[PDB]
Amino acid sequence: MREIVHIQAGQCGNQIGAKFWEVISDEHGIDPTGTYHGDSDLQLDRISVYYNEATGGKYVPRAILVDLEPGTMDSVRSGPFGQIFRPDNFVFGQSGAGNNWAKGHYTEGAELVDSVLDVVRKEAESCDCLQGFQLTHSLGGGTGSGMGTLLISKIREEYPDRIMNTFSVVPSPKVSDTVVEPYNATLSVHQLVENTDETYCIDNEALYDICFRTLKLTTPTYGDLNHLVSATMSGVTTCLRFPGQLNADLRKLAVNMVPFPRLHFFMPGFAPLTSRGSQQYRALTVPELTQQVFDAKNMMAACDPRHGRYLTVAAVFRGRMSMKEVDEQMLNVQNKNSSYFVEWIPNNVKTAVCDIPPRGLKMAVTFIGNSTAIQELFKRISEQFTAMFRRKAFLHWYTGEGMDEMEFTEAESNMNDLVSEYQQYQDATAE
Amino acid sequence: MGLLTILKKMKQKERELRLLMLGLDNAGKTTILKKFNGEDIDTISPTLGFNIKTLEHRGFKLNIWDVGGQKSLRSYWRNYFESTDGLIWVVDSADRQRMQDCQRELQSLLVEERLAGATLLIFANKQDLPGALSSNAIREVLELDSIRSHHWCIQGCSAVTGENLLPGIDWLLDDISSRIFTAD
Amino acid sequence: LEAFGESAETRALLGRLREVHGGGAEREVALERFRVIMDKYQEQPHLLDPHLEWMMNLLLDIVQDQTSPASLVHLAFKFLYIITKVRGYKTFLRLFPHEVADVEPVLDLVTIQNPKDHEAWETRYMLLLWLSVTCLIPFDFSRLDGNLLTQPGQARMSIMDRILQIAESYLIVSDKARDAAAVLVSRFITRPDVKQSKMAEFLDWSLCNLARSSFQTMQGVITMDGTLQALAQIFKHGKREDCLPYAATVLRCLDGCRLPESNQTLLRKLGVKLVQRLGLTFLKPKVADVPEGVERVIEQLLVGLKDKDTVVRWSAAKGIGRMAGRLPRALADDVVGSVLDCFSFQETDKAWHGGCLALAELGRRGLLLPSRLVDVVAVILKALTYDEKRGACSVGTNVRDAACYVCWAFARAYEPQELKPFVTAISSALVIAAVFDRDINCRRAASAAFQENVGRQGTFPHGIDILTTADYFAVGNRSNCFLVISVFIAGFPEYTQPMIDHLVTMKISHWDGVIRELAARALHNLAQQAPEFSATQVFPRLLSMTLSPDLHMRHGSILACAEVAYALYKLAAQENRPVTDHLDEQAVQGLKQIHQQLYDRQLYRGLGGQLMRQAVCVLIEKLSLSKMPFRGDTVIDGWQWLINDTLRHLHLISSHSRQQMKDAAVSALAALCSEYYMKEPGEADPAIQEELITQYLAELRNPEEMTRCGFSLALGALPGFLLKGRLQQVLTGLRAVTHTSPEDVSFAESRRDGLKAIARICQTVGVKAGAPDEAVCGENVSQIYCALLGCMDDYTTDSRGDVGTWVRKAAMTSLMDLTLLLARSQPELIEAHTCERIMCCVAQQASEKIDRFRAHAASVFLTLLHFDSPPIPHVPHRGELEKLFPRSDVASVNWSAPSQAFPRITQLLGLPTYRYHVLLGLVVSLGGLTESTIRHSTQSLFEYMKGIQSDPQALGSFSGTLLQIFEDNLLNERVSVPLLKTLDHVLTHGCFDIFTTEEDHPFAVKLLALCKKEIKNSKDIQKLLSGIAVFCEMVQFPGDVRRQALLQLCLLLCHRFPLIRKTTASQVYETLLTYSDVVGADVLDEVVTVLSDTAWDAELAVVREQRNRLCDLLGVPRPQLV
């Protein structure tokens, strides 16, 4: 019984966490009342990984909400599934940070870190075997990313033998109109490269393009981006929430998908892509699903895996299919003399099989790739860092709080070194 | 909560003072409020409830309340005796018959457990009236001299002409700022 | 932010509500727009105070209209709620209406609310608070009802009755409406009529809720929290004579509820809150006969300070402070004594936070007596220095925060004469903490307390002087507080010895290495303000700490000793006196036993071995840079050894601290050789010069890589006087490693370090024209330039990636360090051919695809070109390059960004000498894999081709250079696919549109043959695709080349891989659709159908016939099996 303590910081992180919880509640079979009305034995086979055992068979999530203002904390408490969460799991302040990393990491963040670690320890003590920690947040805000990095560092210092997962979200100009989002994006990346094991990059530019073109939406909002993020998250943790022949361990999965301790960034994808309301279209075969999941269009990141090198790949299918079909497909794809040869799939994919598809779909597939193309994203924000740091724009907001230009130079050097290492390993021999 | 956050909160609370205005009916409790802001007083109606006004003066945010001076509205004054930094009792100088009602109302308000921490301002309104009692006479009928556990004071004014109100408000604000903090 | 500069936008957004309430996408957009506009003032919402009223009235004239639909009313209430979270309800509700005509319109709206509608929770929240702001009306609820017996058969229910039935229902909900129900009852039961009518009913309901509810059932916990909050609010905002009668039954029930043992943090906090609310109902409010329940309340509130959460500790401290302020002066002493018990030795650090909070709360009111000064103060001195390590984490932040809070509350707890006895122990504590504290919150927490103390009292030594400098913003940077403000504070005699003692005791023995280094660097400067005290008292102290069993303490003490020795040497160097004047024989005697006491305890093993080596190397460097008196003593022979061993065991050091270790060892060796290895002025020891050099040279051949890497930098750090007649051997030994041998294929770091070592050696010896084995002369200058250029073509590619690039970096910084030297001595040595080759190589390494090496190369090029003192001779098109890169524009250029580099590098094609190399370098970027780099390079190349496309001569020379580059890299896998992709792009863009006029151009006639020879017998899929694209783009050239390309395209259509078969047809379709003159209209509807119908991914034998049929249409000879 491996228990994973879930965490969600910032407005975007809290919203993504709530959406993912509400999505998996319908798959596991737990009504929002806090009881299980599911009719499948496989559902309760691994429910303890994300739910606690209370009196009367009531399942309580393991999430820990954290913020610096109360607005979003109040919206989730009154949401469709706002009763399952414990009232004492909501930690918040009043003033917020103000889209400032120094104010959300060193002042208010470090001020509420005590109350947050209180609940973190209270939750960790109620677990038979703790596996790791998960956090959902963004990188274009102050409170969110600041408190996320601070809590990650604290959990690493107090629990060095625990895995860390961060479903960080990369901002984009087409979604936000804030000028200091590059600075906060650079600092969080520097902190994560030092205190993280897994980082699922979820670009906010790829999701917007998908919602605008694929879904054919006139004016997409955060509701068309959060649904996709929650769907991808549910598709990623399909093995960690249900049985499976493949090894569904978090530590072993991270070890196999983290061959490099600085290139631990993973691009996640999922086909078929659906919107809100309309989700029951058709049932795609295994070949079509594999072709769509490995397509740059079904990628949550703005980078294309084809423009790089495949280091590690993890595929997870769910629906009504046998492992033999997936194995034959994956073996014929790499066969250069077959009639189904492609040029965007490596010669080793960790395939998985499941019998519990999501809601509104009969079959689904998820892919996670440690390709080097993600470096492109690291170069997209870096350029912006050069169009501000050189002019010292809005630097009095950071230096006035306590930060030094020595912290900015170190973060820039770390980002440059990461990009250089990625580009260097991209040119390695494929032996 | 950190010391810095605790101090940020103490400053915001001290920047906002509270002044509860009371007195017998038809004593000019609304006219003084309307004159202190620069509004019109000819179109004033007899208050049939209560009013609140948030103004700024000498860097202080004054949330002045004004409750009815009626008997059926006197049994509810206890609903506004919380976080009151100052009290302002209005008295009609031209009123010579109901001089004991105000003296009885102020005495009952002085023996209040919640109003012990505030500065008393006696506004002897309606001074231009030919039959208006001077400040010395009113200082002897309201039994103001006996008071010792309250920083009281009495100044004659006229709301219609806006006279002697600013000095009284300034004295009240100075006496309120002379202290540091208040009790819970 | 001075004012609200978004009034028109907010007004328009509010007005658009009446025509966006029927939309689902626009509604969310407007909501998200209203949220982001209002969140800008979350840190200072007071600036919005002048606007509140107008926006509130706008949202009110939409929810206060009878023609308003539910959906439109729900958006207005959502906006109203958005304005109440930012300003807060306590301040925003004072402006809401409160007229007697708003009592029934608001209660009737509260009676059409769906409790099961989770989407409309903001509506219910705004409803309850409005109903509560309407219970202030100074009238009886009876006067409003009028006559209840007007409806025969069913009498109407009273307004007060309805409100009691609204509050009881909303106080057991799971949404945010329950919190709005807590604010309603607080203004419903606390009035006269309701007090006499429904107080008993509500109390029975609450006592029933807390008599049946549990902390296990979810709804039970929901019932517990709401009831406790309601009771607390009632006891807070309730009269004391109407409440005291019920205080005896409420506590008796709370005691039986068992809250302390329950596993809920909110329930316990509310319980402590309700316990402190009942506690003050028994005492009389004071303005600065003890029932039995007060003792039980105190016993409960003194057990709420040892809680496991700070949210409950703060509430317990507030309750204790509020209770002590009401009790007599006798029980206050007992309460203080009982609270002081929290600071016992057996109590944990959590109990200390609550104790300090209670002490601060007591001092704020001025209840602590003078007799409690010798004790309480004695505890604070420790709470300010609380910093322990509990396993892998650290604790002591909240303790120091509470200590600073207590210190800030002592400026009004005692008279200036009452606290006059402890102004020497508390001023030293405040200052010391604000200066060395780790956390920034504590530092500024100590800064505010000191400011308040010097403002109210003003009896601290140099209060204004210390406050002006160490202000709120000055203590923001931790580095500034340790190396600058610390010296300013130590300038006075009252803050010198205490600070040094605190630094040497705790900070030196800290668990963090960065903190220890900062403390050592701070002591370095502090020793200047107190040399005698640091040489007679601190040096014995640190010397005894170097013999401690603790590893971190030993490292810190060694660093402190080294820094103090360096400071003493610097200070003595001013008066021109030896360093022995400060340190005594015993002090210099103990500085010669540190390393022999570490090596004899085997303290150089394990994880601490690297730290001990670093500390000892820093100490040796600081001692050698001071000219200590250890010459001739065997101790020197020890130090040297400890260096060599390090260079021999670099692979044992972790990968996160090997570079720093190597650099420190090299620096120590350099400082030692230029101090303890000199026989005479200008000469060196013959025995050591020989043995060290032979050992180092023989070590260069060790198969281990890290050893060679270390010994390279070691050779590159020796002084100049030790290489007066051994340069001809050291240079040869260094060049022997720079060569790539069959065994040293993946050995790139060794050569990277050898190049850097050759740079340093060449810089130290300088140039002397005539002396080969002493200095760089015209005899050993060519060999150096040849060895440096032979490492610029290091494109070694392994499973680690393109590691060879690293070596290239060492070739750009080395070749520079040499050139700049010659120009500053003998510019004649800089030959023309060598300079031209160096410039062309720098140009190629600055037109690469990697972004950090390309940026390094451009900077080196600019530095070599912007050299004017003197100007480097023999510079091809020097003026041209200078005009292309003016000094004014170089000040702001993003060379790392391809967009701000490729358009500036493509212009170099205009110069003949650069045209070739620059293109060979840009081909890798034009045919790489990075998408942004490909796009930028292609755009910059087309921007330059547009200027020479209509020129037969320029275009011809460009094509010739491209084909020469292709031929030179024939069969080269690192240049074949990229150059093929570049050619494909250039052909698709239509740059060579002039050569397509005639027939059989000398360009394509050989380009096609080269492509054929390149793709002859190729299995790579990418190479095959590139070749197919090139052969499908080359069709534009008429003549025999077109027929040969068509024959190749037919040959490739029938390949072993069905994928290639399909891609060839897919590309041939596009090629035919593009160029129409290639095939006439008489056989054009016969090719498209065969390509669309024929399945090129099916049986190859069957597709051979269709493919052969497409050879009889295109007119291509049909090949056979040879």
Ligand SMILES: Nc1nc2c(ncn2[C@@H]2O[C@H](COP(=O)(O)OP(=O)(O)OP(=O)(O)O)[C@@H](O)[C@H]2O)c(=O)[nH]1
């Ligand atoms: N995809 C997505 N991005 C979001 C969402 N909410 C916010 N963002 C992005 O998050 C970034 C920062 O905003 P938040 O995360 O809400 O801010 P915060 O992290 O709470 O920080 P403070 O505002 O300083 O308190 C911006 O770039 C937004 O575009 C959301 O629901 N979905």
Ligand SMILES: Nc1nc2c(ncn2[C@@H]2O[C@H](COP(=O)(O)OP(=O)(O)O)[C@@H](O)[C@H]2O)c(=O)[nH]1
């Ligand atoms: N002559 C005179 N009349 C006044 C003065 N102040 C108020 N009044 C009048 O007295 C009446 C009572 O005023 P009002 O403010 O309604 O009394 P309140 O309702 O107790 O505050 C109004 O008609 C005022 O115009 C004053 O200073 N002098």
Ligand SMILES: [Mg+2]
């Ligand atoms: Mg926010």
Ligand SMILES: [Mg+2]
């Ligand atoms: Mg009135």
